[PDB]
Design a protein around this ligand. Structure first.
Ligand SMILES: COc1cc(C(=O)N2C[C@H](C)OC[C@@H]2CCO)cc2nc(N[C@H](C)c3cccc(Cl)c3)oc12
Ligand SMILES: *[C@@H]1O[C@H](CO)[C@@H](O)[C@H](O)[C@H]1NC(C)=O
Lengths: 250, 11, 27
């Protein structure tokens, strides 16, 4: 996260770190949606152009964390993966369309002050909140700028951007399964995700019922925090039928 | 060794 | 049923330092 600030303790209890076993490193962000399911970006697991193809056994899920590097004894919980499910129409070739994957954990995670699931939106949540100008929150342990790394989880709030502006910012084809967010150059505030934040959540707090909803998944940007560029996020509600299908089957 | 070691049970 | 409610915030009715910035944007 570029130009964010340190998260407060327990501010994002759904935040998950995907942690690579060997070499021991930050793989990506993720989010806890139930005691056994974690949501992330498909490209965190599978992206052939960068030779990324992780299997269940390659990584761990670390929940309840704050510090990037410490083993937070009695606070974090570390879980193993039972199975990975990548959207079958994830389009890694062209534009990361449907950049979404679910991971089932081997055992339920116990909830605590530090560990708690986020809600997924339904159609009415999406229609109410996914509006140009409305702000969401992005959190992660990724890089502090494009070209170092945070001591603790970073947070930034960022406005949703009008679809024509998003499209006009890039030569990549943007789909209805994506939205973009970030400040315009004139706005005089900054902030973005960056390397290692992919797969993490873009959340919004419903003013109707006072719950947090995961509206997006950190997907991709052209660099980090560049003027006239934006962050592209997987539209969670548009892919929710798939989410429900996988969770109902498995 | 950027990351602190994990208990061995998780590996 | 309890999704999206943070034990250290909503559950104790404490706000974090910037969730108001989100609320003020929901015009
Ligand atoms: C395969 O994952 C990624 C790819 C790229 C990319 O360079 N590309 C893909 C885009 C669809 O096509 C263009 C070209 C293809 C290069 O392979 C940029 C990426 N940025 C990230 N994640 C970082 C955290 C990020 C930074 C800022 C905002 C957001 Cl929302 C996210 O993942 C990326
Ligand atoms: C990734 O690995 C799995 C099993 O290890 C394999 O079946 C799959 O085809 C691989 N995909 C690639 C390299 O694109």
């Amino acid at each position: 996260i570029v130009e964010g600030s340190d998260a407060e303790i327990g501010m994002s209890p759904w935040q998950v770190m995907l942690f690579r076993k060997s070499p021991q490193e930050l793989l990506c962000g993720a989010s806890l949606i139930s005691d056994r399911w974690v949501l992330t970006a498909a490209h965190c697991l599978l992206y052939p152009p960068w030779d990324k193809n992780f299997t269940e056994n390659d990584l761990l899920v670390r929940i309840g964390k704050h510090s990037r590097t410490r083993y937070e004894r009695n606070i974090e919980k570390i879980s193993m993966l039972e199975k990975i499910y990548i959207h079958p129409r994830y389009n890694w070739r062209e534009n990361l369309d449907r950049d979404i994957a679910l991971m089932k954990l081997k055992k339920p995670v116990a909830f605590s002050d530090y560990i708690h699931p986020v809600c997924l939106p339904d159609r009415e949540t999406a229609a109410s909140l996914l509006q140009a100008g409305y702000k969401g929150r992005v959190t992660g342990w990724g890089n502090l700028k494009e070209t170092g790394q945070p001591s603790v989880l970073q947070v930034v709030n960022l406005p949703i951007v009008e679809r024509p502006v998003c499209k006009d910012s890039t030569r990549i084809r943007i789909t209805d399964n994506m939205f973009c967010a970030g400040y315009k150059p004139d706005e005089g505030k900054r902030g973005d995700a960056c390397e290692g934040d992919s797969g993490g959540p873009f959340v919004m707090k419903s003013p109707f019922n006072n719950r947090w909803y995961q509206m997006g998944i950190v997907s991709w940007g052209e660099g980090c925090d560049r003027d006239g560029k934006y962050g592209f996020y997987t539209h969670v509600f548009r892919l929710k039928k798939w989410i429900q299908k996988v969770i109902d089957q498995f | 060794g950027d990351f602190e070691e994990i208990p061995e049970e998780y590996l | 049923a309890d999704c999206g409610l943070r034990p250290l915030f909503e559950k104790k009715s404490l706000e974090d330092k910037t969730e108001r910035e989100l609320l003020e944007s929901y015009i």
